[PDB]
Amino acid sequence: EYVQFESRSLLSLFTVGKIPPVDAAALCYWGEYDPEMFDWSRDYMIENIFENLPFWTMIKQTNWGRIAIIALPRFVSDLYSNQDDAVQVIIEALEMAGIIGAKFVSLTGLIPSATDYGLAITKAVANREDLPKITTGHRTTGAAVVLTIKKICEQGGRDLSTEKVGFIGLGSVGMNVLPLMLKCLPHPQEITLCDVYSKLEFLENIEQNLVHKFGFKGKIKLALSKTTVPQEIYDSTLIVGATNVANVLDIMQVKPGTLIVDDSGPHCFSVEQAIKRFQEREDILFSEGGMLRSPFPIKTTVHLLPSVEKIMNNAQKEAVFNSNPFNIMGCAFSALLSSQFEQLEPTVGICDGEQSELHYQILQELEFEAGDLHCEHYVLPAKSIANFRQRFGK
Amino acid sequence: AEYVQFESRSLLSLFTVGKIPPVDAAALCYWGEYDPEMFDWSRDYMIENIFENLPFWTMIKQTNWGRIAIIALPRFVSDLYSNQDDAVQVIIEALEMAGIIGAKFVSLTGLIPSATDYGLAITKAVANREDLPKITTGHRTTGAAVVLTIKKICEQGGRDLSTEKVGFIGLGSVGMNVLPLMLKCLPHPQEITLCDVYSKLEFLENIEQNLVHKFGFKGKIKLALSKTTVPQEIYDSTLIVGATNVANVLDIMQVKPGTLIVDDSGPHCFSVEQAIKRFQEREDILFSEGGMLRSPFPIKTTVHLLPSVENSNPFNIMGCAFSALLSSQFEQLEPTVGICDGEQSELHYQILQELEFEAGDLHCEHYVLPAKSIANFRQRFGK
Ligand SMILES: NC(=O)c1ccc[n+]([C@@H]2O[C@H](COP(=O)([O-])OP(=O)(O)OC[C@H]3O[C@@H](n4cnc5c(N)ncnc54)[C@H](O)[C@@H]3O)[C@@H](O)[C@H]2O)c1
Ligand SMILES: NC(=O)c1ccc[n+]([C@@H]2O[C@H](COP(=O)([O-])OP(=O)(O)OC[C@H]3O[C@@H](n4cnc5c(N)ncnc54)[C@H](O)[C@@H]3O)[C@@H](O)[C@H]2O)c1
């Protein structure tokens, strides 16, 4: 009903006037390359499967405008391995996005992390006026994570003021979330800051700002990761993830009663292990952190890459047809917010991010909340959440 | 292979990312005629599953005077004549795509003008839309190409046009561009026969009066109507100029030895297979396409074949399609919609001569007439 498959090219349908222009776009990529998961080399897949071209695969029609979802013809490791090439393929996708009407384009996933948070792109297109404006969307993502912290505490039957909160990954998203959480939600009793060893001095400065600028009066701890998080992180009762490295947290070692909000993509813990533990014990709550729930249903048009349409053609793989029609990622929705509300300026670079409050406030005014607790394909059943709340609430 | 490049990826996609430049003009074509015997699938299966009811940008012709996109409508020719409303609808969808990729003018090739009131049904449906490119039938440039082919086929056959008995088969939009232009630019022939269907008799009689009282033709004029196939009187002509919208109305096996045949009809008004077979055995006719131009420079062609559907002379370009480029580069060459007068046709002829264009080398569809066999014809039947 709210999800429709389109076998014909969206680009073709647009150029003949059969579908209207969009107001915004969001750029994504084709996950990660693993030679043991595909029949072909990385170069073969880029040239012959992705055709070295951006691919317009989805339209999300919201109450606040239409967003095109456009996949770059790259894997995430390609973006990190040659920034010049990443910027060039992004500029190619921006030209397509402008033709189909986008005024603002969000850089989803790890594209900001790989492109100096967009600054490498804006420098390369400074001599052009024919392209949409770019945004990392991280202020909206930060607002979505804070909404999810609020939601997961409510669903768990606990107040944030009694939690010991562990932040795993204090990069662009993580440092949007932490100040906004302190500004908008009750302060927890303890905060642990966890990142890699080379960022010790960076974390020490955050600790100073926590005391003197954000007004945090609780206990502050620093925890340095090597290949995985240190064991002290498992003393936390609420874990907030935003890493660029998968599987650094062992979900089987979190204590019963722990709440986990994770914006990392791929997740900083094993999704399959989390689902298994939850189904067997119902003693954690865990969720994506970046997903918003719109008050109005969203109409999604899906055009699969004809390769994927045939191989990933399980009749049950049409879980797309049944994905929640109220959900939209905050990063992608940020491009619509910047076009609806001029004060929500696009973000490029590491930004001061106190304007994250403006994103949180406008989402609250529009009656957005965090998406219902879920992790990738798996929705946590409401009765199982109630069982957790009965046992581990306060 | 230096001038024809095959592209595996969508030209539309390549354009939208800036990998290929915009075009200056476009030309709309269609997928020929649907033969149920030859084809394996059905008509609706190919329209909905193979063409996807979408126009298909299949070629780019890079010339010394700009780039033209060749765009195939998702229809067969019989679909255009039977349903003018649907034809105009898919044409307007193709025009929107053509505008996006840069085309300022769009030629309506083949039988598209004949099936759409020569473009008037299109201009009526676009109404007050001000974003689409301008359409042209291109028939003034087609007419110039035919006159250039008449000149060339008499050059190579060793024949003088002033002594020929010329028979025109089909006096529609193209035919009535060719006839006045031939008289204006070439030596007047000895005799002209006008042949069209029975119901256009009064129309042909009016042409006859214009030949004597407007165009100053002093030779013999004869009218010969068709009921189905052409009348026997047409085979008395030594030069036959064809421009019909019906195939196989002229029997190539009944033309007299030494006959020259210039045919712009598509499909041709005679059997091409029988024409090639007779030429190789007897070498007693010269026959050629009439609408094909020869550029002085080789044209680079990019070809993107439609996947489900999936040796040209690099100097050759059809006059109809090239007309869209001419209108985009020369403001004085106005586009043609409807049945227009033939005064401006000399402008197209003079510009093509100025650009060192001539008619394509004698050929019919895929078959090229070997220059040695042309010399033999000039030996046996060349005045
Ligand atoms: N789905 C979306 O559209 C979307 C939008 C925004 C962010 N994200 C996801 O959020 C996550 C963070 O994005 P970002 O721009 O802030 O990236 P970032 O590169 O700026 O920050 C990542 C942080 O993770 C830290 N980290 C790496 N290994 C670690 C370990 N073993 N222990 C603790 N910390 C470690 C890094 O040192 C770094 O500080 C990414 O996975 C990204 O894909 C997804
Ligand atoms: N390849 C190209 O791009 C291109 C461009 C222009 C014209 N053409 C071809 O030229 C031909 C004519 O085009 P047009 O716009 O002038 O079409 P038209 O409909 O205006 O004229 C066709 C004429 O042929 C006549 N005719 C039909 N049956 C006849 C018969 N049995 N005997 C004598 N005359 C007969 C019609 O009555 C009609 O007057 C078409 O086949 C068309 O496809 C091709």
Side-chain angles (χ1 to χ4, degrees), chain A residues 251-252 254 256 273-281 283:
Chain A
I251 197 71
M252 301 308 297
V254 308
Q273 285 198 291
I275 297 168
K276 176 180 175 69
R277 176 173 176 168
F278 183 75
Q279 288 179 321
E280 294 177 355
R281 309 171 196 168
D283 72 338

Side-chain angles (χ1 to χ4, degrees), chain B residues 314-328:
Chain B
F315 293 86
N316 284 352
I317 184 166
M318 279 298 196
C320 179
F322 190 64
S323 191
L325 261 183
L326 289 177
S327 285
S328 71

Side-chain angles (χ1 to χ4, degrees), chain B residues 28 30 81 108-115 118 137-139 142 168-176 195-197 199-200 203 224-231 242-246 249-250 263-268 289 291 318-321 339:
Chain B
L28 305 189
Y30 43 87
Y81 270 134
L108 310 172
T109 74
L111 285 175
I112 294 176
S114 177
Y118 306 98
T137 66
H139 287 179
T142 301
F168 288 86
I169 306 183
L171 288 151
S173 176
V174 172
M176 277 314 293
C195 170
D196 208 299
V197 300
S199 55
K200 300 197 171 193
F203 182 82
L225 307 169
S226 302
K227 305 300 266 284
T228 51
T229 54
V230 299
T244 73
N245 65 333
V246 179
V249 300
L250 171 77
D263 193 30
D264 188 56
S265 313
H268 284 279
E289 306 275 356
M318 279 298 196
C320 179
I339 299 290

Side-chain angles (χ1 to χ4, degrees), chain A residues 80-345:
Chain A
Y80 281 118
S81 71
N82 192 305
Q83 194 179 256
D84 291 329
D85 172 69
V87 167
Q88 183 50 46
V89 298
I90 287 161
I91 291 170
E92 291 165 14
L94 292 179
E95 193 166 334
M96 170 185 288
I99 289 172
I100 66 176
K103 310 306 194 309
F104 294 86
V105 177
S106 292
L107 308 176
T108 74
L110 283 173
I111 294 169
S113 182
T115 58
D116 198 13
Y117 303 95
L119 292 175
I121 302 162
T122 53
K123 188 179 195 298
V125 302
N127 65 344
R128 289 179 75 169
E129 318 298 319
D130 64 318
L131 293 179
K133 304 178 189 177
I134 67 175
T135 182
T136 66
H138 285 183
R139 289 178 178 163
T140 312
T141 297
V145 176
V146 174
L147 289 170
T148 307
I149 294 174
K150 175 180 185 288
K151 183 158 195 172
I152 203 169
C153 287
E154 297 169 338
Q155 292 297 314
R158 310 218 292 267
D159 192 73
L160 190 55
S161 56
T162 57
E163 295 305 288
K164 297 148 66 182
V165 179
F167 286 86
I168 307 182
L170 286 159
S172 175
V173 170
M175 278 312 297
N176 275 99
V177 172
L178 170 59
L180 184 61
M181 182 195 76
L182 290 174
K183 176 62 179 181
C184 293
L185 300 183
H187 288 199
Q189 73 176 62
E190 178 180 322
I191 290 174
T192 297
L193 305 172
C194 174
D195 210 302
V196 297
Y197 263 81
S198 72
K199 300 206 174 182
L200 172 55
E201 180 176 341
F202 175 78
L203 300 177
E204 292 173 342
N205 180 250
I206 300 175
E207 176 173 19
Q208 293 306 125
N209 292 346
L210 282 173
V211 174
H212 295 115
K213 288 160 206 60
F214 305 138
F216 184 64
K217 299 100 152 190
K219 183 183 180 185
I220 304 171
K221 299 164 67 191
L222 306 187
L224 300 182
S225 293
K226 306 174 187 179
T227 68
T228 57
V229 298
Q231 295 301 104
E232 288 72 29
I233 267 295
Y234 301 108
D235 300 331
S236 293
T237 62
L238 165 67
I239 295 176
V240 182
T243 73
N244 68 330
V245 176
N247 296 339
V248 295
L249 174 71
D250 184 355
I251 197 71
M252 301 308 297
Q253 301 189 50
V254 308
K255 291 176 171 50
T258 305
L259 314 170
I260 305 98
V261 175
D262 192 28
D263 192 51
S264 319
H267 283 280
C268 72
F269 60 92
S270 166
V271 173
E272 290 310 315
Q273 285 198 291
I275 297 168
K276 176 180 175 69
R277 176 173 176 168
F278 183 75
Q279 288 179 321
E280 294 177 355
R281 309 171 196 168
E282 290 180 356
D283 72 338
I284 55 171
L285 292 185
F286 64 107
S287 188
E288 308 283 349
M291 185 71 74
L292 296 172
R293 189 202 183 274
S294 163
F296 306 102
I298 296 164
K299 183 181 177 62
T300 299
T301 305
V302 179
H303 176 54
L304 302 173
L305 198 49
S307 156
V308 165
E309 193 275 337
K310 299 183 178 185
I311 54 170
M312 286 196 260
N313 205 346
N314 299 340
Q316 298 177 341
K317 274 185 179 302
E318 288 184 348
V320 182
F321 208 94
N322 307 283
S323 58
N324 192 322
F326 294 94
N327 282 357
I328 185 169
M329 282 302 289
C331 173
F333 189 62
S334 195
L336 279 188
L337 286 174
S338 289
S339 79
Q340 282 271 351
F341 306 99
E342 287 298 309
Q343 196 180 8
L344 306 181
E345 58 169 340

Side-chain angles (χ1 to χ4, degrees), chain B residues 28-42:
Chain B
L28 305 189
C29 61
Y30 43 87
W31 296 101
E33 181 73 302
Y34 175 79
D35 289 355
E37 156 62 39
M38 298 180 54
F39 285 133
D40 193 10
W41 315 322
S42 68

